[PDB]
Design a protein around this ligand. Sequence first.
Ligand SMILES: CNc1nc2cc3c(=O)[nH]c(N)nc3c(CC[C@H]3O[C@@H](OC)[C@H](OC)[C@@H]3OC)c2[nH]1
Ligand SMILES: CNc1nc2cc3c(=O)[nH]c(N)nc3c(CC[C@H]3O[C@@H](OC)[C@H](OC)[C@@H]3OC)c2[nH]1
Ligand SMILES: [Zn+2]
Ligand SMILES: [Zn+2]
Lengths: 360, 360
Amino acid sequence: DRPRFSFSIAAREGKARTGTIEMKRGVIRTPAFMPVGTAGADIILGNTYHLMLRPGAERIAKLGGLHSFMGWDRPILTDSGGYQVMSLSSLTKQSEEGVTFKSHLDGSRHMLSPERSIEIQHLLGSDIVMAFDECTPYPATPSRAASSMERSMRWAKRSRDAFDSRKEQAENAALFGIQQGSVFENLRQQSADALAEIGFDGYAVGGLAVGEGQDEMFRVLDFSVPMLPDDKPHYLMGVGKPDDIVGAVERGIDMFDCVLPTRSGRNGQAFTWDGPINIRNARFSEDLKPLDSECHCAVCQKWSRAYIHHLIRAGEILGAMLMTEHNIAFYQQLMQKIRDSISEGRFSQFAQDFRARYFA
Amino acid sequence: DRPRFSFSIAAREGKARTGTIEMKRGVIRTPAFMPVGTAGADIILGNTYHLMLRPGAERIAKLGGLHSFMGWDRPILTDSGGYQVMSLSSLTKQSEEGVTFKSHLDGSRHMLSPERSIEIQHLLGSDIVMAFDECTPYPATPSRAASSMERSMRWAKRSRDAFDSRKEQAENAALFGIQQGSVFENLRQQSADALAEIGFDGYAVGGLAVGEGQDEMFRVLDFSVPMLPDDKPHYLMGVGKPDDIVGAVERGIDMFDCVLPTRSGRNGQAFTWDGPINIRNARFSEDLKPLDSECHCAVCQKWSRAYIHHLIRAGEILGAMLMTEHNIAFYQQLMQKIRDSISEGRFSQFAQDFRARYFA
Ligand SMILES: CNc1nc2cc3c(=O)[nH]c(N)nc3c(CC[C@H]3O[C@@H](OC)[C@H](OC)[C@@H]3OC)c2[nH]1
Ligand SMILES: CNc1nc2cc3c(=O)[nH]c(N)nc3c(CC[C@H]3O[C@@H](OC)[C@H](OC)[C@@H]3OC)c2[nH]1
Ligand SMILES: [Zn+2]
Ligand SMILES: [Zn+2]
């Protein structure tokens, strides 16, 4: 029987690592991409913020938990909810206790605190639970970044204690802490130290992919990822485009999530090894090639760019579904190639070849 | 090797029949439902009117024909295009030659005539080609219904001659004639006689499902279907709801098409043996049963009403795709049950049981 949580590094190249997380519901191969569950992957995401508002966490628990609800019996990761509250909610009120906000769907009042976030995630039944943090806005002054990070670290301890108080959660799920500190090395160090003192099963790099751009994101990763425990997984939240993933793996990241595959799939963008393409453009109306020349997905085995272009232009849902299936599969082929290249000691060459072709 | 076209009736009960159409690209089991190709089925529909306008029939032929374009190597049926021209186009101009109209997409002028309709269908590469007819509006006076039907019969002969002039089409495709005459028995008889004198591979009942309602449609079918050759397939165009299909089979119809499965699937309606349900309604938010209790489709094997409700309410494309997959599968299970019940001599009981449950 698999353990509750065990991360093992099978091979390394530079700062890059490849290995496995073993959990009760399955093995997660790393580096991992974690797609939205409502879109192969070893773990999917539940959308805590949406589920809080519709149908509510209690109701999900009444229906048997997310795994039953979604028909997915493998691992599920949930965020702690505050990022989306601050991003999407109205008339939010912040305090040391947490955040209160009004639901855009029906005006009901909702609060989120470390304790309530952990309880929501418990009711949803997720396997990887995120600590309740504050994603500091960018840019931030040093003073405000420090004050925000300090609050997040107090909330990380409250998250740890709430998770440990729930026997079923403590025995069957895992808890990740989230590093903050904006772009400032000293604050990132203080945050890493505070999280390691509390102790978590994995460590996320928070506070990035919030408008800083790739050069700055990579600069922050260069010093931030080494501050985290080496023997635990490293999750970069909100990232990203394929080139962001490759560079983040080069800097020691093991886990990724982002809206791009599905957002692109619904908006006419297909990922390929030669970069993204806008399938609605007339230049694809007579292109008999598959979406990508090397892709093994079922869409690329059967249908042309011309036909997918036609479906999307005609407003047919089949078109968006085919685009999304291809994009999901592309991302998982990217991660497989990353894992294999690290395991084979040729990831540096892979990254160079990837960039030369993706940006040609 | 299969023939170009051969219809064989394997069993009968009342006016109902079950059997097979053999064509070069496949066998079609009848009674048959023929889904839109852009949505198992033995034949799918190509949308002649849309394809004429985007990308155009010549361009489809350049891309290899519909079968290649759509990735479907089995039979395809296309309509002749006028129904949609009169239904959707602007500033149409009608004459004995055909109809001219302006494309809503780009203002280009297009004409349709019997000869051009057959040529378009040739370029698309369909296997079952419909004669170019005029679907008389409902209601129609006897005089106007007669004048319209007479023009359609002249156009049926022109369609026959155009089809026969194209060797590849004549040798590999089939041509159906379309009966008109509105709701008038004498005109339906004149139309049937004219079509049989020309000679077609199959016969459609046109001019129905245009606002007359089920009682009147069935009344017209009661006298109209027996007028067609018994030994050829009978196609009721534009029909319909499950209860319309059952009653039309009871009246001698062998083939059906309609927008309902896909339109419903995109608009939150799921077909079930207990009637249609509106999955977005709050009454399904905690319903753990599948869409239908007896359905064998992959959606009903895996997911609940509650989850499909959730996806559709969240605006997720996955929800509409699951609804459509279920609805397509429901329609094909309906047709299989129809075929088996006729073959087993229990279709009368099936129809009675179907109606008692569907309308409970
Ligand atoms: C786009 N840039 C981006 N930077 C982020 C930074 C943070 C952060 O510092 N803290 C937390 N807790 N969450 C973050 C998030 C949200 C990730 C979730 O966003 C959700 O998608 C909307 C997704 O779950 C369906 C995922 O949860 C696993 C970020 N997103
Ligand atoms: C809804 N009621 C309805 N009554 C109809 C009657 C006629 C008729 O008398 N003549 C012709 N030629 N076509 C008819 C049609 C259109 C069927 C096509 O309609 C297309 O869907 C929009 C479908 O092809 C994707 C199909 O072509 C195979 C009808 N539709
Ligand atoms: Zn593909
Ligand atoms: Zn089903």
